[PDB]
Amino acid sequence: MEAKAVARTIRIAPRKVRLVLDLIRGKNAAEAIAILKLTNKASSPVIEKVLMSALANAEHNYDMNTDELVVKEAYANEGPTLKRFRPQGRASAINKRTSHITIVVSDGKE
Amino acid sequence: VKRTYQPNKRKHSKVHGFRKRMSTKNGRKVLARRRRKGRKVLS
Amino acid sequence: HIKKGDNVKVIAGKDKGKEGKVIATLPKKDRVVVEGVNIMKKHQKPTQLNPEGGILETEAAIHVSNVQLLDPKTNEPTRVGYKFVDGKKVRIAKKSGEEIKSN
Amino acid sequence: AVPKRRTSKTRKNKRRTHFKISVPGMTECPNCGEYKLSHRVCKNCGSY
RNA sequence: CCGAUAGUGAACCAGUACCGUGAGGGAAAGGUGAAAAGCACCCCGGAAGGGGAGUGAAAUAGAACCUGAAACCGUGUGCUUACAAGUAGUCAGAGCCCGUUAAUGGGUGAUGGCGUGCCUUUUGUAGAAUGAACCGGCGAGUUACGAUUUGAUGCAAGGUU
RNA sequence: UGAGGGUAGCGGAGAAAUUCCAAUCGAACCUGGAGAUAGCUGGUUCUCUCCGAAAUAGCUUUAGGGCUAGCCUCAAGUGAU
RNA sequence: AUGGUAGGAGAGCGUUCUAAGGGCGUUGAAGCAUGAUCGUAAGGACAUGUGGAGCGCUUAGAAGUGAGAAUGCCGGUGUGAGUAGCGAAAGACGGGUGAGAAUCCCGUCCACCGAUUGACUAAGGUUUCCAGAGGAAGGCUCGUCCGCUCUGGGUUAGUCG
């Protein structure tokens, strides 16, 4: 039994979001939330909102108890990048990269 | 530093612009070329 | 070539063999609409002069070539022609004589 | 300033093995609230 | 016959964005309909999701309904694999598998020997000679019309168009 | 030092430097002749054939280029050559 | 008895049509992209995806025919680093507002320019001016401002120019 959520086109570059995504992988949902609360990184609040969305999915739509759930998968894919011309330097380009954050949570049973 | 192109409205209407181009024959040829190309602004 | 008050049989589509009355015509894209035929289920939002909204089971338009007039004499689908009676043009039924419609 | 050869995938990822985040502290909230930073009355639910 | 790097620069917002003081230069981007029927309705965070729902003959067919592919790149799983000096392959084999459009089939990944490009240009190069990731419009042999040399014939005392 | 004027490229302007004429100047910029010409450099691919040629004298308003001979492939022929 | 960047006469395939014949196809037919077959080829007949209405085979003819480089062009795509840099100057605390404040607003203190980083008038620019409210982008943050949206807008001369 697995619930998931994705957040699409989040405006943080994927290298910066995979760093904190490596912390919560394979842990329990409660201690995952605690790890996300005690890291000062720009993407801990985004990821925490996706994780709370997936736990809400599991409780509401599949009637899983939210105290047994572990974070089964957590990953970040590249979304579409936006190209900006930096005027501040000399006419060289800057891409705003964006990402897709997927979290899936489960009770380990079948 | 001071640049090329220091704008001026009267000068711009006086060296280019419709009545100056219609006043010579080569100027009328630029307006005929620009019509024939279908330009939105002739001058 | 059919009109607003007619009684038709549908000859192609999910409703097939069904009959009905045409109720609007939309001729510039050739789509009549027949009652009881090709029912959609529209997801209609809450409007300013409405409740929250229904599944709105109404008829959708059908292409005009999937529909054939019923011969008034034999109730078979038939094509139509035009007879010229006294400067007026009437539809005839191509297996019999006239078919009369005003509604 | 320039690289002569492009670096491969394997050399890039061998360089990134120390480039990661350490796990935080977590002295737990015994009175009330969420788990707070170690030796903190942290600003979100601190009951140290 | 153009079949849309197209008879067109432009079958879409085109001599338009934009660039240039001006003469002038000059793009990209095309693509339901089965029918919007375009996620009423309803439930958790703004965006975005998860559910149901649907005209849905089929939404990983959700505004990227011309669908729609590839490769580069990814990224998260795992099976096997960790005393060294390397044109990374090739020829000599423990663990793990298991077979289609079918029969020394199909394999996968560990060891001792041996080891220099489309390439180009050169007497000679593999660079300490040149030039270079992936994809592609997409990128290098007609006739006006002649000459000369290599199949079939009116058809051979013969040649007409 | 401001405003408004003027002088234009086979030309102008120059207390003269080959200096300046829109970030350009031993002769600006744009379009056209124009696919200029390039005895030089680089490129030249989906086939796979099979088998088979290799590479110097002589002349040169022009000599790291060219032409004819040599060394050639392929096809006929004569046929002891 | 049977090699050659230059050589002759060879059998073949991708696109198109004739000019045909014969097929696979709306109980599905593709093609195309992922599959064990054919192979020196180039090029085609049976498991996923696709759709959801388009292709092959045979023989012959015609070539926008004919796809690793040209410091090739680009619809173009994407890499190679958490690196360089973030463009002169003094801020601190309290309150407030908020989903969220080194950033926004109010306060107090401190500081800087002071022949000016002050106040007017030209040229030039053309709605940036003023209120509300969300800012999906914009700003080398956030919005919780304007230089996006709506209008609510807003420019008044006998004497100024």
Contact C58, C39 (CB under 8 A): yes
Q: If DSSP codes are grouped into helix, strand and coil, which group holds residue D45?
A: coil
**Distance of alpha carbon B14 from its chain centroid, rounded?**
9
**Strand E closer than 7 A to residue B5 Cβ:** yes
Q: How distant is the Cα of D18 from the closest Cα of chain A, in angstroms?
A: 12
Contacts of A41 in chain D (CB under 8 A): 21
Cβ–Cβ of A22/D21 closer than 8 Å? yes
Contact B31, B20 (CB under 8 A): no
In whole angstroms, what is the distance from residue A97 CA to residue C47 CA? Answer: 40
Distance (Å) of CA D14 to CA A17, A45, D4, D22: 19, 29, 19, 18
Residue D33's identity, in one-letter code, is: G
Cβ neighbors of C78 (< 8 A, separation 6 or more) are C68, C69, C70, C71, C93, C94, C95, C96
Stated length of chain C:
103
In whole angstroms, what is the distance from residue A71 CA to residue A35 CA? Answer: 13
How many Cβ pairs closer than 8 A exist between chain A and D? Answer: 26
Nucleotides of E under 7 A from a protein CB: 9, 14-17, 20-26, 33, 35-51, 53-56, 74-77
DSSP per-residue codes, chain A:
-EEEEEEEEESS-HHHHHHHHTTSTTSBHHHHHHHHHT---TTHHHHHHHHHHHHHHHHHHS---TTS-EEEEEEEEE---EEEE-TTTTS-EEEE--EEEEEEEE-S--
Residue given tokens 């000068």 in the structure block: B11
Cβ neighbors of B6 (< 8 A, separation 6 or more) are none
Tokens of D33: 């609230």
**Strand F closer than 7 A to residue B11 Cβ:** yes
Q: How distant is the Cα of D5 from the closest Cα of chain A, in angstroms?
A: 23
Helix axes A44-61, A29-37, angle to 10 degrees: 160
Q: How distant is the Cα of D26 from the closest Cα of chain A, in angstroms?
A: 8
Contacts of D36 in chain A (CB under 8 A): 38
Resolution (A): 2.4
Tokens of B34: 């620009």
**Strand F closer than 7 A to residue B28 Cβ:** no
Q: Which residues pair with A99 in a beta bridge?
A: A10, A78
Contacts of A19 in chain D (CB under 8 A): 20-21
In whole angstroms, what is the distance from residue D29 CA to residue D36 CA? Answer: 6
User: Could you tell me which of C28, C21, C30 has the C-alpha nearest to residue C59?
Assistant: C21
**Strand G closer than 7 A to residue A40 Cβ:** no
Number of domains in chain C: 1
Cβ–Cβ of A34/D26 closer than 8 Å? yes
Range of the domain at C26: 1-103
Q: How was this structure determined?
A: cryo-EM
**Strand G closer than 7 A to residue A97 Cβ:** yes
Q: Which domains does chain B have, with CATH numbers?
A: 1-43 (1.10.287.3980)
In whole angstroms, what is the distance from residue A93 CA to residue A83 CA? Answer: 7
In whole angstroms, what is the distance from residue D48 CA to residue D46 CA? Answer: 6
In chain B, alpha helices (H):
9-15, 18-21, 25-37
Beta pairing, strands C31-34 & C81-85 = unpaired
In whole angstroms, what is the distance from residue A36 CA to residue A20 CA? Answer: 8
Q: If DSSP codes are grouped into helix, strand and coil, which group holds residue B32?
A: helix
